Amino acid sequence: AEQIEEVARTVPGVASALAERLEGGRYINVEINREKAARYGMTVADVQLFVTSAVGGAMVGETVEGIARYPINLRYPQSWRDSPQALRQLPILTPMKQQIT
Amino acid sequence: VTSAVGGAMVGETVEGIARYPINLRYPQSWRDSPQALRQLPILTPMKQQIT
Amino acid sequence: DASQFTLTVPARPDKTLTIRKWTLLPGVDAATRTLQLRLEVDNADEALKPGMNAWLQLNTASEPMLLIPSQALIDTGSEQRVITVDADGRFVPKRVAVFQASQ
Amino acid sequence: FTLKAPIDGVITAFDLRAGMNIAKDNVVAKIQGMDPVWVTAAIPESIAWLVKDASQFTLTVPARPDKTLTIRKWTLLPGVDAATRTLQLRLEVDNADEALKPG
Amino acid sequence: FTLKAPIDGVITAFDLRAGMNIAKDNVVAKIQGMDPVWVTAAIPESIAWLVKDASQFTLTVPARPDKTLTIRKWTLLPGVDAATRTLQLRLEVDNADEALKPGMNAWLQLNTASEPMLLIPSQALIDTGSEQRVITVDADGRFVPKRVAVFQASQ
Amino acid sequence: RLAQYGISLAEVKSALDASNQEAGGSSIELAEAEYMVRASGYLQTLDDFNHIVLKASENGVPVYLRDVAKVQIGPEMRRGIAELNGEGEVAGGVVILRSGK
Amino acid sequence: TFAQSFPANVSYNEYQYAIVQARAAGFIDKVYPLTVGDKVQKGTPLLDLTI
Amino acid sequence: TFAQSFPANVSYNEYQYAIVQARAAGFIDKVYPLTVGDKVQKGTPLLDLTI
């Protein structure tokens, strides 16, 4: 698609040609470590809860006001999740009341 | 009965498109015959070892 | 050592506390897996009651490195780059090796 | 004076240390042997009958699959543990190589 | 009189303050050193047969990435922890920079190989709760089960 | 091993059931770009099974699934059995035609 | 021939039991490099005291 | 072939161990700035007492 794209703009009548990339997306992977976590006595799910709800805006429930509906969510202030480094020091309170990152 | 004696499927692993079954069970020996079941080792919630 | 600490207590947002001194205790609490950092706070007004909570924000200087606004740093996980602006306005990209970011 | 360990064993208690004083009721050291190391197996109460005098026991420890243990003797204790609902069957195992560690 | 700290250490207990009275059994100070600092690893009982004749380990700690060092001398304790059925390996580490502080986590790394033994893929070991054996292929290619005796698996 | 380590069957099933799933933690803005946050946690290694946390003391010393179970690859309860020329068992497949085509 | 298996705990020899108590009172002069968990053979010095 | 990571913890030297008891009964005159957690050194004053 990248070759076919750049050859399309060399053609007499074409104005603007672009090909949508299939893997041009960015990621921030949280490669959990079963050993490191089991240490503090945490299951994968236990860790992940922070990923979805603490870092992400995971919707936990919905309030009801008549016909209408409202979304509720949990999350640390945007500051604790600004950048990757911020996540590396994402404050976690283990089940055993141990404070870690 | 279901998991210790029987091969009750507890979950499924994921590898791409395909699927895989996971199960719990005592070695076939503890469930060979009826008598073996009569002495099927159980660890009660109160950490008491019984058959 | 060169760190800069600034204390604040939720119970009394009207007070500005001065820190007499601070000492990083030698023994880390084995129950919390945390180092102990003890501060001594001027409290003649008695507005700071024991049991109260207190937020401790610190600022630490680091070895001089090249610094740029975080927004100007692209990352693909395998290479990090920025977009330099030439003398003639020409936008030219260059690879850089990141050290660490904060704030 | 000099207090020496009266027997070959493992220190399981040590209440006295430098600087202190010492008294009659104090314990400078508790020492437990392990050459004829003990092994206590748990037998569910309902299968009591299963163990008779003519019985033949064969021991194996996961930690050392390379060793073959010989059993000095065995005795079916008179009191069943009230917490586990099991009879106590105590074995005494030859252990001069010290490969059989307690626990 | 004046009571002074007999050794360099850290006060882990101080049971009497001012205005008080003291007695023989009273403790004024519990001071523990930490320069030749101690570290203890919990090694699963399963591999006692291996670690006995062990060579070296590679100690590492989370709080300190640089203080990662090899350990060539240690001491295996005669007692394993009942609660977790693990061997207790204790090692002493030089610590003048007061880096390793008591309470921090650590990781004792071990990479080794056992004495030459007969080896077969784990997939080949048909084992019940007592009957372990494998299926062999003779000359002509016929099948024949034989009772074997397992030592221990690995990878 | 269960009794020896003080772990009930239920404790196992429950722990197992929470050490094999992925979770997403929203996205995040860097260089004006969306950064999806993926949290790993899928089972795919035997070691992963062998490293399913069951119990952890204050010490930090945990008790993994590998302490109460061997994790072997085996056959499922067979429902269909296929034989060929009476000289071997094999896997097959049958094409079903949409009745009336 | 009946056949069943049971789990067991390798515990200390309780007939080989020694608890050192000072025959009389006094104060500690020195305490040899020894802490709970170590293995001491007969004749291993525990401490020195003045009585 | 083996390659396993065993968890460990940092602790105090139990061969560098000292409990400071008073040789004989008496009352405390004064006690120096020193509480559980502080790092002391050989010679550091603990408390003044009358016996």
XYZ file of C-alpha atoms in Angstrom:
716
model
C 0.000 0.000 0.000
C 2.997 2.267 0.612
C 4.444 1.669 -2.862
C 1.072 1.815 -4.608
C 0.393 5.002 -2.641
C 3.506 6.903 -3.725
C 3.092 5.844 -7.360
C -0.442 7.248 -7.332
C 0.791 10.806 -6.785
C 3.103 10.541 -9.802
C 0.108 9.982 -12.091
C -1.006 12.990 -14.232
C -4.487 13.528 -12.775
C -4.321 12.433 -9.128
C -4.636 15.165 -6.481
C -4.228 13.408 -3.123
C -3.692 9.674 -2.578
C -3.320 7.998 0.829
C -3.319 4.405 2.076
C -4.606 3.604 5.561
C -1.922 1.726 7.472
C -3.019 -1.497 9.146
C -0.543 -1.482 12.027
C 0.168 2.205 12.552
C -1.214 2.254 16.075
C 0.629 3.072 19.281
C 0.586 1.078 22.521
C 1.718 1.189 26.141
C 2.041 -2.434 27.235
C 1.668 -3.448 30.885
C 3.567 -6.742 30.814
C 2.548 -8.100 34.220
C 5.002 -10.363 36.052
C 3.289 -13.297 37.762
C 6.330 -13.789 39.996
C 6.767 -10.149 41.033
C 3.038 -9.879 41.771
C 2.547 -13.231 43.510
C 5.244 -11.844 45.801
C 2.838 -9.226 47.141
C 0.157 -11.903 46.912
C -1.681 -10.480 43.902
C -3.445 -12.315 41.093
C -3.261 -10.999 37.533
C -6.799 -9.646 37.874
C -5.825 -7.854 41.091
C -3.122 -5.973 39.214
C -5.255 -5.310 36.129
C -7.994 -3.603 38.145
C -5.605 -0.674 38.477
C -5.029 -0.684 34.715
C -8.718 -0.481 33.793
C -10.070 1.600 36.654
C -7.114 3.492 38.147
C -5.323 4.379 34.903
C -8.258 3.977 32.530
C -11.717 5.442 32.993
C -13.421 2.063 33.370
C -17.173 2.568 33.802
C -18.229 0.878 37.032
C -21.948 1.626 37.118
C -24.894 3.705 35.966
C -27.123 6.066 37.925
C -30.807 6.372 37.125
C -32.765 9.548 36.763
C -36.113 8.750 35.229
C -35.875 7.678 31.620
C -32.295 8.933 31.258
C -29.056 7.151 32.201
C -25.739 8.269 33.670
C -22.236 6.650 33.613
C -20.075 6.405 36.747
C -16.349 5.744 36.763
C -13.280 5.425 38.968
C -9.812 6.824 38.272
C -6.745 8.494 39.755
C -6.349 12.181 38.862
C -4.936 12.520 35.342
C -1.549 13.286 36.905
C -0.753 9.751 38.065
C -1.259 8.585 34.477
C 0.240 11.461 32.479
C 3.079 9.517 30.882
C 4.555 5.985 30.887
C 7.039 6.901 33.622
C 4.073 8.030 35.729
C 2.634 4.531 35.311
C 5.933 2.968 36.341
C 5.336 4.733 39.638
C 1.595 4.094 39.636
C 0.724 3.894 43.363
C -0.695 0.476 44.283
C -2.033 -0.600 47.680
C -1.557 -4.381 47.699
C -4.172 -6.586 49.419
C -1.674 -6.901 52.267
C -1.612 -3.138 52.811
C 1.840 -2.800 51.237
C 2.428 0.414 49.287
C 4.190 -0.220 45.985
C 4.504 1.023 42.425
C -17.015 -35.022 42.632
C -16.910 -32.849 39.508
C -13.348 -31.570 39.628
C -11.373 -33.987 41.819
C -12.929 -37.245 40.601
C -14.292 -35.995 37.287
C -12.389 -33.977 34.712
C -14.542 -30.869 35.121
C -13.362 -28.172 32.702
C -12.540 -25.059 34.711
C -11.389 -22.668 31.998
C -10.074 -22.081 28.497
C -6.728 -20.718 27.350
C -6.469 -18.542 24.266
C -3.954 -18.860 21.504
C -5.052 -16.720 18.603
C -8.137 -18.033 16.872
C -7.884 -21.449 18.543
C -9.138 -22.496 21.991
C -7.828 -24.802 24.707
C -9.607 -26.587 27.631
C -8.170 -26.595 31.164
C -9.191 -28.987 33.913
C -8.509 -30.054 37.488
C -8.334 -33.615 38.814
C -6.553 -36.007 41.160
C -4.296 -38.550 39.430
C -6.395 -41.385 37.997
C -5.310 -43.523 40.955
C -7.450 -41.805 43.590
C -10.492 -42.517 41.414
C -9.698 -45.975 40.028
C -12.584 -47.825 41.653
C -15.528 -47.142 44.003
C -13.479 -48.151 47.049
C -10.895 -45.565 45.981
C -13.668 -42.960 46.106
C -14.705 -44.120 49.565
C -11.225 -43.035 50.588
C -11.201 -39.977 48.341
C -8.943 -37.512 50.215
C -10.832 -34.341 51.175
C -9.390 -31.250 52.866
C -12.380 -29.704 54.655
C -12.669 -25.892 54.861
C -11.510 -26.245 58.463
C -8.263 -27.914 57.399
C -9.450 -31.341 58.565
C -8.236 -34.279 56.472
C -11.004 -36.783 55.785
C -12.274 -39.283 53.244
C 20.372 15.148 49.983
C 19.712 18.127 47.713
C 16.007 17.234 47.638
C 13.361 19.871 48.342
C 10.354 18.978 50.479
C 7.095 20.912 50.808
C 4.459 19.846 53.342
C 0.680 20.303 53.333
C -2.077 19.062 55.655
C -5.719 18.780 54.473
C -7.138 19.687 57.896
C -5.607 23.170 57.835
C -5.286 24.524 54.267
C -4.872 27.992 55.787
C -1.484 27.216 57.331
C 1.944 27.191 55.702
C 4.322 24.874 57.565
C 8.082 25.307 57.825
C 10.206 22.155 58.069
C 12.859 22.267 60.809
C 14.711 19.276 59.356
C 14.319 15.855 57.748
C 16.047 12.492 58.011
C 15.731 9.383 55.865
C 15.514 6.634 58.495
C 17.915 3.673 58.042
C 15.294 0.948 58.433
C 12.516 0.356 55.912
C 9.204 -0.723 57.434
C 8.966 -4.455 56.763
C 5.161 -4.340 56.724
C 4.736 -1.633 54.095
C 7.913 -2.116 52.056
C 8.572 1.620 52.364
C 11.507 3.732 53.508
C 10.820 6.036 56.427
C 11.279 9.765 55.907
C 10.836 11.701 59.149
C 10.177 15.444 59.131
C 10.061 17.795 62.124
C 7.508 20.574 61.746
C 7.215 23.882 63.586
C 3.948 23.652 65.527
C 3.511 26.277 68.250
C 0.009 27.147 67.065
C -0.965 23.520 67.739
C -2.937 23.330 64.486
C -1.051 20.177 63.492
C -2.667 17.362 65.490
C -1.155 13.834 65.594
C -3.093 11.277 63.556
C -3.756 13.877 60.871
C -2.760 13.163 57.284
C -0.052 15.058 55.436
C 1.020 15.121 51.799
C 4.774 15.293 51.198
C 5.792 16.511 47.740
C 9.490 16.511 46.860
C 11.631 17.931 44.076
C 14.933 16.300 43.123
C 17.569 17.709 40.779
C 19.238 15.328 38.333
C 22.427 15.204 36.272
C 22.279 17.810 33.462
C 20.876 16.356 30.246
C 19.374 17.808 27.069
C 15.813 18.911 27.861
C 12.744 19.307 25.653
C 8.964 19.672 26.146
C 7.539 16.169 26.497
C 4.973 16.856 23.766
C 7.807 17.162 21.234
C 8.941 13.581 21.787
C 7.636 10.867 19.471
C 8.001 7.188 20.343
C 7.346 3.962 18.434
C 8.726 1.681 21.141
C 11.792 0.831 19.074
C 12.909 4.340 18.133
C 12.411 7.795 19.603
C 12.677 10.939 17.516
C 11.824 14.624 17.320
C 11.210 17.128 14.532
C 13.908 19.785 14.252
C 13.208 23.065 12.452
C 15.998 23.942 9.998
C 17.340 27.425 9.270
C 15.127 27.790 6.192
C 12.023 26.550 8.000
C 12.606 23.073 6.590
C 11.208 20.486 8.995
C 13.782 17.751 9.512
C 13.482 14.697 11.788
C 16.251 13.226 13.960
C 16.613 10.251 16.309
C 17.409 10.799 19.984
C 18.100 8.576 22.981
C 15.780 9.295 25.896
C 16.985 9.455 29.502
C 13.911 10.112 31.648
C 10.898 12.424 31.866
C 8.896 14.072 34.648
C 6.359 16.886 35.041
C 32.000 -19.684 82.834
C 31.335 -21.064 79.358
C 28.058 -22.707 78.372
C 28.471 -25.215 75.541
C 25.814 -26.921 73.425
C 25.178 -30.196 75.295
C 24.146 -32.051 72.135
C 24.431 -31.992 68.348
C 21.338 -30.252 66.997
C 19.653 -27.104 65.716
C 19.139 -23.891 67.684
C 15.400 -23.306 67.825
C 15.467 -20.595 70.485
C 17.948 -17.990 71.662
C 16.678 -15.420 74.142
C 20.013 -14.169 75.456
C 22.402 -11.852 73.635
C 25.287 -9.444 74.254
C 25.154 -6.868 77.043
C 22.222 -8.402 78.902
C 22.060 -10.025 82.299
C 21.025 -13.651 82.747
C 18.667 -15.491 85.101
C 17.534 -18.983 86.102
C 14.347 -18.831 84.038
C 16.090 -17.527 80.912
C 16.797 -19.668 77.852
C 20.265 -19.207 76.396
C 19.539 -21.893 73.801
C 17.035 -24.557 72.815
C 18.613 -27.316 70.742
C 16.809 -30.056 68.827
C 18.524 -33.078 67.295
C 17.747 -34.677 63.950
C 20.057 -37.649 63.367
C 17.301 -40.148 64.091
C 14.987 -37.585 62.476
C 11.259 -37.900 63.077
C 8.499 -38.134 60.473
C 4.865 -37.914 61.536
C 2.233 -38.965 59.003
C -1.445 -38.025 59.196
C -4.012 -40.812 58.890
C -7.734 -39.973 58.531
C -9.756 -41.362 61.454
C -12.104 -43.490 59.351
C -9.235 -45.558 57.935
C -7.779 -46.405 61.350
C -8.172 -50.141 60.722
C -6.003 -49.939 57.596
C -2.834 -49.830 59.706
C -2.027 -53.048 61.574
C 1.129 -54.448 63.186
C 2.136 -56.502 60.148
C 1.913 -53.377 57.976
C 4.761 -52.428 55.644
C 5.801 -48.789 55.347
C 7.957 -47.214 52.638
C 9.056 -43.577 52.910
C 9.931 -41.041 50.209
C 10.780 -37.327 50.331
C 10.341 -35.067 47.260
C 13.348 -32.894 48.147
C 15.800 -35.780 47.784
C 14.611 -38.344 45.199
C 18.181 -39.672 45.105
C 18.056 -41.052 48.647
C 16.558 -44.305 49.903
C 15.575 -44.028 53.571
C 15.547 -46.877 56.075
C 12.956 -46.748 58.863
C 14.359 -47.478 62.335
C 10.887 -48.016 63.797
C 7.297 -46.768 63.832
C 4.608 -46.234 66.450
C 0.919 -45.447 66.071
C 0.434 -42.698 68.665
C -2.477 -43.191 71.119
C -3.985 -39.730 70.674
C -5.609 -38.568 67.443
C -5.050 -34.899 66.623
C -8.326 -33.175 67.477
C -7.731 -30.463 64.873
C -7.189 -32.720 61.867
C -9.259 -35.751 62.871
C -6.262 -37.954 62.064
C -4.328 -40.628 63.934
C -0.650 -39.920 64.448
C 1.862 -42.357 62.982
C 5.419 -41.495 64.008
C 8.405 -42.888 62.112
C 12.087 -42.588 63.037
C 14.366 -42.279 60.020
C 18.106 -42.861 59.722
C 19.576 -39.454 58.871
C 23.349 -39.181 59.303
C 23.783 -37.599 55.877
C 21.518 -34.765 57.059
C 19.644 -34.732 53.743
C 16.323 -35.003 55.583
C 15.592 -31.489 56.868
C 12.708 -30.789 59.304
C 9.740 -29.039 57.700
C 26.180 6.496 85.280
C 25.948 6.561 81.491
C 24.795 3.677 79.309
C 26.243 3.715 75.798
C 25.586 1.757 72.601
C 28.043 -1.185 72.628
C 28.030 -1.465 68.821
C 27.115 0.356 65.610
C 23.517 -0.493 64.768
C 19.850 0.455 64.682
C 17.501 0.794 67.653
C 14.842 -1.875 67.153
C 13.585 -1.445 70.726
C 13.683 1.260 73.403
C 11.419 0.322 76.299
C 12.118 3.108 78.817
C 12.018 6.916 78.758
C 12.489 9.752 81.256
C 10.962 9.983 84.734
C 10.961 6.196 84.930
C 12.638 3.537 87.067
C 14.739 0.690 85.701
C 15.192 -2.965 86.657
C 17.379 -5.951 85.791
C 14.941 -7.273 83.176
C 14.202 -3.860 81.649
C 15.621 -3.170 78.189
C 17.053 0.261 77.451
C 18.122 -0.541 73.887
C 17.880 -3.234 71.225
C 20.579 -2.370 68.695
C 21.179 -4.456 65.576
C 23.949 -3.957 63.035
C 23.589 -4.099 59.266
C 26.983 -3.544 57.618
C 27.666 -7.193 56.892
C 23.967 -7.198 56.021
C 21.977 -10.443 55.865
C 19.851 -11.814 53.036
C 17.733 -14.967 53.093
C 16.260 -16.799 50.106
C 13.280 -19.163 50.080
C 14.184 -22.089 47.834
C 11.439 -24.677 47.177
C 12.197 -27.989 48.903
C 11.767 -29.737 45.554
C 15.305 -28.908 44.419
C 17.244 -29.596 47.621
C 18.932 -32.461 45.784
C 20.329 -29.848 43.392
C 21.190 -26.808 45.517
C 23.208 -28.889 47.971
C 26.055 -29.155 45.466
C 25.329 -25.683 44.098
C 27.934 -23.361 42.607
C 26.989 -19.687 42.634
C 23.923 -17.452 42.679
C 23.333 -13.934 41.352
C 21.820 -11.655 43.992
C 19.741 -8.659 42.927
C 17.509 -6.148 44.704
C 14.654 -3.974 43.373
C 15.535 -0.822 45.301
C 19.094 -1.059 43.951
C 19.751 -2.082 40.305
C 23.514 -1.531 40.545
C 24.081 -3.585 43.700
C 23.550 -6.767 41.689
C 26.408 -9.140 42.547
C 27.308 -12.825 42.326
C 27.264 -14.896 45.516
C 29.872 -17.648 45.795
C 29.615 -18.344 49.525
C 26.469 -18.879 51.584
C 24.988 -21.188 54.200
C 22.031 -23.536 53.822
C 20.054 -23.909 57.049
C 19.032 -27.333 58.444
C 15.423 -26.209 58.794
C 12.891 -25.477 56.070
C 9.888 -23.205 56.518
C 6.847 -25.346 57.284
C 4.383 -22.686 56.162
C 5.832 -22.565 52.643
C 7.969 -25.717 52.545
C 11.088 -23.832 51.450
C 14.772 -24.203 52.267
C 16.483 -21.276 53.979
C 19.633 -19.956 52.342
C 21.384 -17.130 54.159
C 24.163 -15.004 52.691
C 26.208 -12.095 54.018
C 26.764 -8.973 51.906
C 29.176 -6.065 52.341
C 27.135 -2.911 52.947
C 29.111 0.182 53.936
C 27.101 2.552 51.753
C 24.087 1.600 53.882
C 22.376 0.675 50.604
C 20.592 -2.554 51.514
C 18.275 -1.611 54.369
C 16.511 -4.360 56.371
C 13.013 -4.808 54.973
C 13.727 -4.632 51.256
C 12.942 -7.425 48.814
C 15.614 -9.321 46.881
C 16.034 -11.996 44.220
C 18.568 -14.827 44.395
C 19.032 -16.055 40.820
C 20.161 -19.612 40.022
C 21.131 -21.057 36.634
C 22.606 -24.564 36.648
C 22.516 -28.141 35.344
C 22.347 -31.490 37.136
C 24.485 -34.611 36.789
C 23.996 -36.645 33.573
C 20.812 -38.722 33.947
C 18.576 -40.641 31.542
C 16.234 -38.123 29.892
C 12.864 -38.398 28.157
C 10.298 -35.748 27.161
C 7.673 -35.220 29.869
C 4.975 -36.000 27.300
C 6.259 -39.583 27.316
C 5.756 -40.181 31.038
C 2.386 -41.859 31.562
C 1.776 -41.490 35.294
C -1.250 -42.206 37.459
C -1.219 -41.649 41.214
C 1.221 -44.531 41.592
C 1.691 -46.162 38.195
C 4.248 -44.246 36.147
C 5.629 -45.803 32.978
C 6.371 -45.126 29.314
C 5.564 -46.708 25.953
C 8.631 -47.966 24.105
C 9.071 -48.802 20.422
C 11.029 -52.012 19.833
C 12.960 -52.981 16.702
C 10.061 -54.008 14.463
C 8.191 -50.956 15.737
C 5.771 -52.765 18.041
C 4.482 -51.107 21.220
C 5.569 -52.167 24.705
C 4.917 -50.445 28.069
C 7.646 -50.574 30.728
C 7.503 -49.500 34.370
C 10.125 -46.819 35.008
C 11.268 -44.813 38.028
C 11.177 -41.016 37.834
C 13.700 -38.704 39.456
C 12.432 -35.194 38.722
C 11.358 -33.040 35.781
C 12.726 -29.705 34.584
C 11.797 -27.529 31.620
C 0.362 -31.631 48.650
C -2.904 -29.765 49.177
C -3.027 -30.581 52.876
C 0.739 -30.196 53.277
C 0.600 -26.625 51.955
C -2.797 -25.896 53.498
C -4.752 -25.224 50.320
C -8.311 -26.311 49.539
C -9.604 -27.326 46.122
C -11.819 -24.233 45.976
C -8.878 -21.937 46.714
C -7.188 -23.415 43.642
C -10.084 -23.159 41.180
C -10.715 -19.566 42.216
C -7.074 -18.493 41.872
C -6.787 -20.318 38.543
C -9.860 -18.505 37.276
C -8.152 -15.138 37.783
C -4.755 -15.715 36.162
C -5.687 -15.902 32.487
C -7.276 -12.818 30.891
C -6.294 -9.528 29.256
C -7.532 -6.071 30.266
C -7.536 -2.652 28.610
C -6.874 0.591 30.449
C -8.133 3.261 28.074
C -5.612 5.236 26.046
C -3.288 8.182 26.644
C -2.069 11.239 24.707
C 1.604 11.500 23.723
C 2.826 13.688 20.864
C -0.826 14.214 19.937
C -1.248 10.459 19.469
C -3.511 7.816 21.017
C -1.642 5.293 23.155
C -3.753 2.233 23.925
C -2.807 0.551 27.192
C -2.796 -3.236 26.936
C -2.429 -5.313 30.104
C -1.046 -8.808 29.492
C -2.185 -11.792 31.542
C -3.053 -14.568 29.106
C -1.983 -18.129 29.859
C 0.184 -19.614 27.109
C 3.171 -21.141 28.889
C 3.201 -24.214 31.109
C 5.339 -22.120 33.454
C 2.448 -19.649 33.572
C 0.300 -22.425 35.017
C 3.204 -23.467 37.257
C 3.303 -19.849 38.399
C -0.332 -19.396 39.389
C -0.267 -17.732 42.811
C -2.206 -19.513 45.550
C -0.922 -18.153 48.862
C 1.619 -15.556 50.018
C 2.946 -14.887 53.520
C 4.123 -11.500 54.813
C 7.671 -12.644 54.103
C 6.944 -12.335 50.398
C 7.298 -16.094 50.056
C 4.449 -17.282 47.810
C 2.950 -20.708 47.112
C 2.457 -21.397 43.406
C 0.240 -23.939 41.655
C 3.438 -25.877 40.932
C 3.576 -26.711 44.642
C 0.378 -28.768 44.592
C 0.144 -29.939 40.983
C 2.008 -31.168 37.924
C 0.834 -29.298 34.829
C 0.791 -31.830 31.984
C -0.559 -31.666 28.439
C -3.099 -34.405 27.821
C -6.085 -35.540 25.741
C -9.617 -34.331 26.426
C -12.585 -36.629 26.987
C -12.963 -38.104 23.514
C -16.509 -38.117 22.129
C -15.767 -39.247 18.587
C -13.281 -41.919 17.550
C -12.003 -42.390 14.002
C -10.206 -45.489 12.727
C -8.717 -46.137 9.293
C -8.295 -49.516 7.590
C -8.035 -51.102 11.026
C -4.401 -50.057 11.269
C -4.557 -46.754 13.130
C -6.633 -44.058 14.798
C -6.829 -40.733 12.969
C -8.553 -37.358 12.935
C -10.961 -36.609 10.109
C -13.706 -34.266 8.966
C -17.004 -34.349 7.090
C -18.436 -31.650 4.821
C -22.105 -30.964 5.557
C -24.223 -29.777 2.637
C -27.071 -27.349 3.278
C -30.076 -29.545 2.717
C -31.503 -28.769 -0.692
C -28.373 -27.462 -2.395
C -2.823 -56.577 49.851
C -4.201 -53.170 50.871
C -2.416 -50.053 49.655
C -2.844 -46.374 50.480
C -0.639 -43.295 50.776
C -0.485 -40.556 53.408
C 1.336 -37.200 53.750
C 3.853 -36.636 56.543
C 5.854 -33.876 58.206
C 9.560 -34.279 58.847
C 9.737 -32.940 62.398
C 12.555 -32.546 64.915
C 13.581 -35.459 67.114
C 11.834 -34.652 70.382
C 13.796 -37.166 72.448
C 16.925 -35.279 71.415
C 15.782 -32.166 73.237
C 18.078 -29.790 75.112
C 17.112 -26.475 76.716
C 20.070 -24.625 78.243
C 19.264 -22.741 81.440
C 21.921 -21.004 83.542
C 22.288 -22.877 86.841
C 22.647 -19.529 88.610
C 22.219 -15.813 87.902
C 24.748 -13.273 86.672
C 25.514 -11.228 83.571
C 26.621 -11.941 80.002
C 30.258 -11.283 79.120
C 30.227 -12.515 75.523
C 27.906 -14.204 73.030
C 29.333 -16.335 70.226
C 28.192 -15.846 66.584
C 25.042 -17.929 66.980
C 21.406 -17.191 66.160
C 18.208 -19.237 66.125
C 18.220 -21.391 62.999
C 21.816 -22.624 63.066
C 23.157 -26.123 63.682
C 25.485 -26.492 66.665
C 27.440 -29.651 67.474
C 28.026 -30.733 71.073
C 30.662 -28.532 72.670
C 29.745 -25.411 70.734
C 30.190 -22.344 72.965
C 26.938 -20.381 73.304
C 27.996 -17.572 75.629
C 30.157 -16.489 78.560
C 28.752 -15.262 81.859
C 29.880 -14.224 85.334
C 28.245 -16.030 88.247
C 18.652 -27.587 32.969
C 17.449 -25.167 35.644
C 16.841 -21.426 35.896
C 14.662 -20.312 38.804
C 14.359 -17.037 40.723
C 14.066 -17.443 44.500
C 12.611 -14.537 46.525
C 14.676 -13.083 49.368
C 14.657 -10.326 51.990
C 17.165 -7.954 53.578
C 17.479 -8.224 57.366
C 19.639 -7.209 60.332
C 22.827 -9.076 61.179
C 21.852 -11.344 64.060
C 25.520 -11.823 64.933
C 25.689 -8.052 65.356
C 23.171 -8.111 68.179
C 23.079 -6.254 71.501
C 20.509 -5.756 74.264
C 21.472 -3.171 76.870
C 20.209 -3.991 80.360
C 21.131 -2.156 83.558
C 23.489 -4.094 85.832
C 21.467 -3.182 88.925
C 18.155 -1.541 89.818
C 17.714 2.226 89.927
C 15.908 5.251 88.513
C 16.455 7.217 85.301
C 18.011 10.666 85.625
C 17.772 11.630 81.961
C 17.383 10.073 78.519
C 19.053 11.257 75.305
C 17.293 12.100 72.003
C 16.955 8.555 70.687
C 13.965 6.468 69.635
C 13.235 3.135 67.961
C 14.362 3.462 64.356
C 17.379 5.718 64.787
C 20.881 4.759 63.666
C 23.265 4.751 66.624
C 26.999 4.104 66.780
C 29.358 2.429 69.253
C 29.719 4.930 72.077
C 26.418 6.727 71.548
C 24.878 7.806 74.894
C 21.614 6.046 75.744
C 20.552 7.263 79.186
C 21.850 8.420 82.572
C 20.706 6.499 85.640
C 21.316 6.415 89.390
C 22.152 3.094 91.032
